[PDB]
Structures are given as C-alpha cells and as structure tokens.
RNA sequence: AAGCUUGAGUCUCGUAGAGGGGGGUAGAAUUCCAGGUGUAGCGGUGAAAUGCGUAGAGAUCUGGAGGAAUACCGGUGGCGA
C-alpha cells in the first residue's frame, strides 16, 4: 500500500466517446474514467465540457496506487484529447513525457462513400 | 506485261510506361481464440431506442489465428484494343 509515484497513462477520444486510463508498463489499467460517465449524449462526450470533468475522476480511480509522475499516450481524433491531460496536470500530476500514437490509415477496410447526410 | 519510288514496311545502336500473363512478396484494424489488470459503464442520432455489459463489458496488455486490399509518391502525369 506505499504509493508508486511513478507510472503511464493513456488517452483515447473518438468522435463519440473520451476515455482515459492510468495504466501500468506491463499494460495493465489501475483505474478509469469515461465521458459518457457525465451522463452526456451523443458527440457531447468527445468536448472538452465532458472530457476536462473526466480526469479527476480518473485520478480517483488510482487513489490507493498513488501516482506523480505519468507518461502519456494519446490516441482518437477527439476534440476532448488535451483538456482532459491539462485537467490531470492541474490535479498535482507531473508529466514526465507526452507521445501521441494515433493511428495512420493502413488496409482501412471499406471507407463511407457513400456517406450519411 | 515490262519499269520505278521520295505511298506502305522492317531494321543495326537505342527510349518511357499503374498494359497483360506467371510467380511471388509485405504491413494494419474492426474480428476470432485463451487469459490477466479493472469497475459500470459501452454503443448511437437531428432527437432516441433496441442492442453490447457484472457470465466482468468498453478499454488496456500477453501469446496466437483469419480474410481482403496494396496507404505515402500520385500530379501538371503514363499505359491498354
């Protein structure tokens, strides 16, 4: 129960959800927060208004790891994809690296065409 | 019929091309497969709701299977009947 004070994070906003871990090297996820967990619907819980409200409550979700220094993945398109880590540096967190890792377009399958209007 | 070539043709040394055929040859995620870490959320629309989820989802990792197409350069561009 001594506190770890060092560790990862891991960021994911997609055009419909934001959803933050703090996570171990090993990749586990110690603890979890959701934008859709605001009760907000839709696109909503990929905004800022939704994601900057969902890293304290991830920051909570650790608060028997103990955390300080995080170093940072981040995924997805989401506009929620830098609030929500200002949010957790605001919390008393320090950020040892930032990286992003969003993915380039590789096979992709089948694209909307053919898109809904 | 006899006579020609400066109509037509083939070629010495050489030129580009996503053309065809046969071979290959390489990578990614939705998925599937066996589990961990972990808690109530996930999914989705102009609005919502069936539905996925506590049988432990979503997500995050370990080791692995499956199928298709060939990102970038790529255009002011080539080739092919």
Known sequence: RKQVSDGVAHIHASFNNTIVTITDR????????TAGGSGFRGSRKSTPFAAQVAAERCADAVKEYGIKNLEVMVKGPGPGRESTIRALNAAGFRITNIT???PIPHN???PPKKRRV
Request: glycine content about 22%.
């Open 100 to 102: 992003d890792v969003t």
């Open 26 to 33: 090993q990749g586990n996820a110690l603890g979890w927060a």
């Open 108 to 110: 992709g399958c089948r």
